[PDB]
Structures are given as C-alpha cells and as structure tokens.
Amino acid sequence: AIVKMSMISSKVIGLVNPAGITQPRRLTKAQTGDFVTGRPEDISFLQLEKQADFTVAKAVSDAIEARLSFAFMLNSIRYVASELEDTLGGVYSILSQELQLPLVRVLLKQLQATQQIPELPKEAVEPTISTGLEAIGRGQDLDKLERCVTAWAALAPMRDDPDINLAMIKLRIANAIGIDTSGILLTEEQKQQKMAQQS
Amino acid sequence: KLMLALFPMQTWMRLTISEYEAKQLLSDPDGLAKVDEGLSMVERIIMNYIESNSYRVTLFEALKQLVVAGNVLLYLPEPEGSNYNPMKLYRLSSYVVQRDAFGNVLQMVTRDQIAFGALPEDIRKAVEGQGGEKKADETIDV
C-alpha cells in the first residue's frame, strides 16, 4: 500500500483552473524568464492528501517489523546459541538431535567401515554427545583444569606450614570443582612408590 | 546464525567414555588419558572429513530449507576411496516419508531425475534392458 501511494505521488498533473486566464500553451512555448501573461494561483498541481493514513500505516509497519526482527534475531560460540539463537526460538536443541547427532552417528560408522578412524577400545561404546550446548568446545573441562591448577599454584608459600596438609586441601578443592584427579594428583600410595623408586 | 551455532569452526561433537566403566579394566589413569586422546583424534578426523567433502554448504542449504519449510532428507553415500562425495540434499519436492504417532514407522521414498548417459552403470544397463534404447538427453526417474 505504501509503495503504491508513493507511485501515485510520483505522477505530476498540472491542474489549471478554467475560470483563470493563464493559458498553458504560452507556458510551454517559453524559455527561461520570458515574462508571460497569467496568474500563479491559476496553475495548481494534484497532490495525494492521504497523509494521516500514511502515518498510521508506517507506525503499524514499524511495529510489525520490530516484532519480526526480535523473532528473527535481527535485533540481537555460546552467546550465539544458549543466549540468543536458543532463546529467540528453541530450535538449536531440537536440531542437535535431528541434524547433528544423526550425521555424526552415520559419519563415524562409515569412517569405521573404511580404515580412516579404526576403533578397537573394547571398553565402552564411545557415545556421541553432540548436543552442542553440552559439548560446544569439548565441554567445560579446560576451565575446570586451569582453575584447579591455578589453585594448586597457590598454597606454595605455605608449604612449610606443618599445621595444614597440602594434599588434603588440594583434593578438597578438586572435589569442590568436581574435576577428576585420578592420575593428575598422586595419592598416598603413588607418592610413596614414587619416593621409593627415586631413592 | 544456526549454521554458526549448530556447526561451528570448533569441534561440535564430543566422544565420552563413561568413567568408572573403563577404569575397572584399565591399568593407570595414563590409559584413560590415552583413550581420551584417541577420542580427540577421532573428533579431529571427523572435522577433517566434514570439511574435505564440503558438508558445510549442503548443511547451510538444508538449514535454510528447514527455516523456510522445515523438512530435508540428507543422503550420505558410502565412502569410496578418497574422492569427495558430498551428501546429496533432497528438498521436500523430491521425497516423501510416512510416520506413525511415535514416528517409529519409516517409509522414505526419494525421487531423483538423472538423464540416461549419466545414470550409474547398473541403472543404465537396467533401464536399457527394461526397454530398448534411451536418448542421452531424456530424463529417467529413479
């Protein structure tokens, strides 16, 4: 509607009042200047008076565009998923079970059928957990590991503090983080056997 | 946005081990770390295969089709040597599906118009045998 009103507006028509004295022939057959007989009020141009309707139409169109943009994320990685992209329509979690997992379940088995990713663990089935949000960047294992290693870096000044037990604190903070320290942290037996081997 | 979220540059799938199921049959945690390293290698190889076969373009086309008309069938041909074989995207107009209430029942039929002369050898001989001679231009429905 707005575009068609604009097209209507584009056309120019010269409304000349018959009761007047201005004759368009002498207007057309005249160069720049060239004083001509007539009155300006006689010549008038048709105009599209439909303005308020234009304003209300523009307001409604703006509102519809705003709601659609909010719906299409035009008015906005994990901030490109979890927040925004999984909040403006929860389809990043329904298409992670329809497109992501099925593809990695078929791609892995085919690549096993050929000799490109030989698997022979005999321990587990190595389940695929594509579930992007869950495993966007190999999970939140690097953050946990760096935090626990940084914490272990501290407490170094207080090594010569017989009252406290460094290993106990280290294991307690590891448990608090929830990280697995089966091999990272040497248990009592591991420490004793390492000391014996060192001799 | 969905293509930058679902399928990003960084690994998008993780291979889990279900700890305490492999620990019992394992010598020292170094074995668990080696298992995790092997899983990471498998993930890297999956990245390599997905990127080498131009899967991203087909996935983006499928994603756009899903947004406009949510449905697409992605056929993954069996690997043959190393020559790239991108998944042949099937739009809505080319395939049909049948589902029960649960979706357990599947009956998927895909229609592809390949002109004689480009028909896989087996199909070329099959169509030639069923009838007489097929023009190299006319389309053959498979």
Added chain:
Amino acid sequence: KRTGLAEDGAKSVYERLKNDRAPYETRAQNCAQYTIPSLFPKDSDNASTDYQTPWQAVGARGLNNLASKLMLALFPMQTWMRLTISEYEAKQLLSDPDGLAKVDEGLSMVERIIMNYIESNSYRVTLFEALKQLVVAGNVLLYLPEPEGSNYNPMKLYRLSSYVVQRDAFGNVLQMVTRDQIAFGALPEDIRKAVEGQGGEKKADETIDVYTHIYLDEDSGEYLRYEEVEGMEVQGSDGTYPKEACPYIPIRMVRLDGESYGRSYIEEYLGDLRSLENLQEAIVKMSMISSKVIGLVNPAGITQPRRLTKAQTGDFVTGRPEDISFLQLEKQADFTVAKAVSDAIEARLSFAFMLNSIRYVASELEDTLGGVYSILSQELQLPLVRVLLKQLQATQQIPELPKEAVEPTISTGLEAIGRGQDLDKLERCVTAWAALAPMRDDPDINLAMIKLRIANAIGIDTSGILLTEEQKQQKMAQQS
C-alpha cells in the same frame, strides 16, 4: 563419427541450446540496465551506443560493494586453501610424527606454489570480473588453458552470451559449448590450415567462429572435448578430460533444481530497483521542471515587463511588485512521501548489499547478509584449486608423490583461512605449558598428566610436540 550428443555438431547444439538460454539473457540484461548497464550489453549493442546511467544509482554501488567483498573474502592476498592429510591413516604407514611434520611442510609448500601460480597469472582480476558477472547474472564459464612452460596464461573468461550449458535435475549431465570469435590472425596454426583447406581464400581481418563442445561419453566414460571451427572439427583438437578435472568449470550463483543455471543475486531484488528508479526519475524530473523560471505578470496590473527588461541596476521603474509573480512547483507533500519511500527502499537495498556494514567480512558480514557465499566456495574455489592441481602436477611445478593419501582440498573459505585454526590451538597450549613451571617442584602432582590433559582439552595433536613416557625414556637412555 562422433557419438551421442555430438552427431549433429557443435554449431547445431549451440543453436538449439541458445533458445533455452534466452530468459537468462533477458533477466541479466534487465538487471544490468537497472544497475550499471555497461556490464551486460545486448548482443546487438555495439560501439556508438550510449548507456543511460540509472537514476537510482544504488544498484551500481551495491553491485560494486558485493563484488569487492566477495573478492576480499573468497580470494584474499594470503593463502585461502588448506591441504589435508587424513590423519592417522598415514600414521599407520609412517615412521615417526616428524614424518607427519614433513608432510605438513610439503603441503604448505604446495599451497605456496599454488599462490605463486595464481598471482603470477593475474587470476585476481579475471576472478573479480567473473564474480561481478555472477552477481549481476549468475553464470560464467572459466576455461583454464593447459600450462605451457612459465609464460603467463590467464584463464579465458567466457561471458554468458559466449556459451551454453545443459543440465539434468542433478546437473550431472553436461553438454557445454563455448563460442568465441577469432579474426583469422590469432588462430592457431592447426585451425588456420583446417579452415584454409575447407575454404578458399580468406582475409586476416574477417572473423572466424570457433566452437568448443564437451559432452559426456555415451558409454561409461569421461568428458570428450573437441573444437569445431566451420562444419568439420579440427583433427589437432581431440583432448579428453576426466569427469573430475574439467578445466571449463561452469559457475552458478543461486542453484535451483531443474534449471541449468542463473538466478543472480540481484535477480530477487529487481523489484526494489524498479521502484527506487521510478521514484528517483520522478524526483529528478520534478527538479528539472522547477529549474525553469517563468515570470507570470498579471494583465489586470500596471507593471509592463518591457520597462523592467530595459532597465539597469536601480533605475526606478513604475509598477507594483504584486503584478509580477513566478509559477512554482507546489508539489511538496508528494515530494516528502516520495523521498521517504525512496529512502526506505535505499536502506533495505543497502543493508541487503552490505553497504551499511577476512573471516569477519566472510563467515559473518558476507554470510548473515547475502544468504550463501559458501556456494561460491564449492563452485569457484574448490574447482579452481582442483584444476590448478593436476595441472601444476602434470607439469613439473609442484611435487607429485603422495603415496600416502589423496591430500584432499578444503579450499572453501570459512573452513580454511590461514591454515585452519591450528596456530591458535598451538599458541594456547604452548602458553599453558610455559606455565606450571613454578609448581614443577611439587611431588603431589604429575606435570606430564596435566600437560596431556590440557592438550586433549584443546584438541590439538600432541604426538610429536609432547614426548610421551616411552619416547622420553629412550631419549634419556640414548643421552646417558
């Protein structure tokens, strides 16, 4: 003697297929007319023709900006394809990870040689022209001539009007004919002798039509290529190319099932261009009308223009100011509404053409806006990287001794800009390893375990960079 698809002849098939190419030519001509018209002139159009400039003048800017952005993203100055190795399939047939490092170095050397060849042949300008033609009328045929020594041989770009293509629903069936005119002066010797034998006496000026036709072998074969000059082919040109490494590489911007090619990016914004150009033409014509000045003098008054004209500065003249008046274009509100609508159209087109904006101007900017630029990364990039290879490989310009894998190409931009992201995943792990030094004298922890764990978390391959227990043991034993 030619089999199916070629018995009638290259000329006949080209004439037959030209009728199916007409709609694409017409839409390309319309798109060119509303954008820069000189880009895609009509066949009849020739010298002495004036290309009236479009009124809107946003289509030209948008086309130029899209072409520039696509050149910058798809084909940057630095490397834009990465050679893969299919890890752990070579390790089974490889001695030590140092061999993997050497293989990676060789692949990098191959990539550098490809960059050198692409730059030395002015591929950038031809590719820019091809991208612009794709944006205005998405279809181009890029012929890559067989390398000869080291002399420059830029690809011979073929505009839409110079060739035809035939595709089935999949597009597997190809029957490509390219028409080019050579004025009997640059004709290679074989073609010149062929035409001289077929005909009588020719002139060095008159044009000679040369048709190159390639088609699928009727049997389980590859593409058959031959050149037809006038009725009969030339015995010299009997080349045969594999279905994979075809150096003609037809291109399409927007691919639709059934259609053999076309659907330019500007094709689906042609309505916006139409409306904006109509509005701008109306506004400009209104301005031109307003430019004319006419002195409307009321006859009922007493002011006579003759004494007004025959008077110097000052020179008091009898009359009344109200007698003399000038007609004006009072069409003002219409001007406001037309300006508002034209501005809205310009804004939508501008952000659609990226006017109101390597890796950010690509996987973003030229991605969220522009639909798919990754179709030109599988239709232009990969095919060119797969022909440059096997051509530089048939000639002795790149090493040819894989004997491990086929070394796939991941040329497609987003995936490979700057040899992937290996350098970041390496600098991060090296920075992590640089740390943990102060806690080395900590009997509680095993540093190697944390190093391996962080390497696994990053996902980088640590086969050679990090010495495992065994290799460290042999190294220490040998050092003694």
